[PDB]
Design a protein around this ligand. Structure first.
Ligand SMILES: [K+]
Ligand SMILES: [K+]
Lengths: 407, 398
């Protein structure tokens, strides 16, 4: 059946606002984590975040007619999509085409705008204080709605949401649409705002790191024995998924082919992973792939329970004969809705540039990871096939396998 | 290619908490719209809603351990899913199976819980006030996560959100998963809470009815010249989408086959959506459940698209929204369910409150009185804000 390739990428993250900045950070093993005064001021225990530091204010980067409908998740996704379109070399007639779609999601929509609106409604500002653009800022589908219009998308247009797996499921579904022969191009990705309004929910459940506020760059430390929760982050990412013959026909640059996609459910525990659903997810994505997995960008968020469940799943699939492993979250933080596309992009850059980004802050490796091929220093290596895992709350799992395209 | 059929349904809506109640409402042309004191107290202009009227509090209907993680959208979808599982006749090993999945969405997730959490942080209780179950209540995917865990779903598990089209895309995607040979069963639907926190956003953009607050049952009036906005509603709905051979082999009751699914974007989009869903369908469209939410511009845009596809030679047409209001995330699955009941029971629900037909609908086959009729193929449109379109075509299984 039809094959899908990635021909363009765009990204706004805690370690870079475009692929050049991100590539440099990945090669340097640079942390994007910083102290979050906003969180301290809000009364939270976690005072660290993977913040997006844009070059200018959004009003100076995006047309006001487009910007008036957006929450930060949409701003990030939009900037990422502009980059991806430029990178892909697509013309307006290919971006706006009956066979070109958009599948982009957010894990949380926009609690900041939602709260701003509800606060205004409870003051004399009333309905005028809410404003007429709140629906696109606050609804769950905001990120797809805010992008479909400005780019004049004519194909599919919707959001997939699934916590940490959100944008991984978006990319996988783009593969499915290409496989079904329904679309030739699908812009897939996600966005996530960074705010105390949403972050406090995670802190209230004890999911966030709180013991490293004085040394922010050391807080996120996947697979380290002294990890104490993830570091919340924001951002956006977009990849241009394209049917193979269509990409070849126009002379597109092919980063990789999406050769595997797994999507499963744990059917147990509402907040932490069970490992068994993760095992099936990895196995499903590896089905039919006739090459070994050279590198894997783990889900590994730096939580005590979560990291261990994933390691157990990895051992069930590969024993100690694992692919090279690193958690980029140790550097970037957990960007929730944007995590899947961010990590797919980090993996594509490692493939394109022949290197493995280090898994930082591992002072003492968790015993469950002993024996595995954990990379802790930037390593040059020819990577052919890569895998990226995304296991979100509610027991939802996604795994993508990508491979260099053989001309 | 694999074929998909619907073998079970469940529903919580403004016109009924089960299929028998919903059927009676549809046949009688009964409005589910009532006066919303909550909206008046909030300072909104629209004081009408399609409220879900559960007799009991959710704590008396759902296990306490499961309920702690849920927002109202999840509560409604969960109850709809219980009804669907029961209706489907599926065994526990078919509900919890590697080849059985769940694709359920919500238009807004839980604005009430996003606000409740933030309000708590601003009080002395702080983090303790927020509590540890707020993420599952407030996250966009809450409605899929809160059902996947308790029903022990092992297959796909995620939400699709697209405003008014949400649950229609969920059903269409269930069909795609069956077609790809990835799942044998997919529980598809949606849920939406009813709350001023979200409703005021619609009132703020002038999309809600505000001139018929003194006669709520007459506020939602799709295709009527004096319509002035939609009436917001809440609820949940779920359908069991199943691969054909699998349904036949277990002796399932088959409501209909999903023979078409279109999904497009405006960027004519509606026309293309309808045409896509009708591709390969070798029978005429007997009845169409329109998107028609009762907005001045929206209704005319849809009428224009219908006219482009069918001219005046349209299938029989009615808007059940005139009775139920607009349930956003749950609208697609609710309307799919109403259409299946019309097929199963051989009748066309009336499009009520049309005192003066909009000039743009002149010549079309708009049904305004309940009509008994053998329906074989039906279509349901869901054209949501953001220019996202979904159309489903279902047909009796021969
Ligand atoms: K990953
Ligand atoms: K409809």
């Amino acid at each position: 059946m039809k094959r899908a390739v990635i021909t363009g990428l765009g990204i706004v993250s805690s370690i870079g606002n475009n692929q050049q900045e991100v590539l440099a950070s990945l090669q340097e093993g640079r942390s994007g984590i910083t102290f979050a005064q906003e969180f301290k001021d809000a009364g939270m225990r976690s005072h660290v975040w993977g913040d997006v530091k844009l070059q200018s204010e959004p009003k100076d980067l995006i047309d006001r007619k487009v910007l008036r409908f957006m929450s930060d998740a949409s701003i990030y996704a939009y900037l990422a999509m502009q980059e991806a379109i430029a990178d892909s070399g697509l013309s307006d007639s290919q971006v706006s085409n009956f066979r070109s779609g958009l599948v982009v999601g957010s894990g949380g929509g926009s609690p900041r705008n939602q709260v701003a609106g509800s606060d205004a409604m409870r003051t004399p500002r009333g309905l005028k204080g809410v404003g007429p653009y709140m629906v696109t800022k606050a609804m769950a589908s905001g990120v797809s709605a805010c992008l479909a219009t400005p780019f004049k998308i004519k194909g599919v247009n919707y959001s997939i949401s699934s916590a940490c797996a959100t944008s991984a499921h978006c990319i996988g579904h783009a593969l499915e649409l290409i496989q079904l022969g329904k679309q030739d191009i699908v812009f897939a990705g996600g966005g996530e705002e960074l705010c105390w309004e949403m972050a406090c929910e995670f802190d209230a459940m004890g999911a966030l790191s709180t013991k490293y506020n004085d040394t922010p760059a050391k807080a996120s430390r996947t697979y380290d024995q002294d990890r104490d929760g993830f570091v919340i982050a924001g951002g956006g990412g977009m990849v241009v998924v394209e049917e193979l013959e269509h990409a070849l026909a126009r002379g597109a640059h092919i980063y990789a082919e999406i050769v595997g996609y797994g999507a499963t459910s744990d059917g147990a525990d509402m907040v932490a992973p069970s490992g068994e659903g993760a095992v099936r997810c990895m196995q499903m994505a590896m089905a039919g792939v006739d090459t070994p997995i050279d590198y894997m960008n783990v889900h590994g968020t730096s939580t005590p329970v979560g990291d261990v469940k994933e390691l157990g799943a990895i051992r069930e699939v590969f024993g100690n004969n694992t692919p090279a492993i690193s958690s980029t979250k140790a550097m970037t933080g957990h960007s929730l809705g944007a995590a899947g596309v961010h990590e797919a992009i980090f993996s594509l850059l490692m493939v394109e540039h022949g290197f493995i980004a280090p898994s930082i802050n591992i002072d003492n490796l968790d015993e469950q990871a002993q024996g595995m091929n954990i990379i802790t220093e930037t390593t040059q290596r020819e990577l052919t096939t890569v895998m990226s895992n995304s296991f979100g709350f509610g027991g939802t799992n996604a795994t993508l396998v990508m491979r260099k395209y053989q001309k």
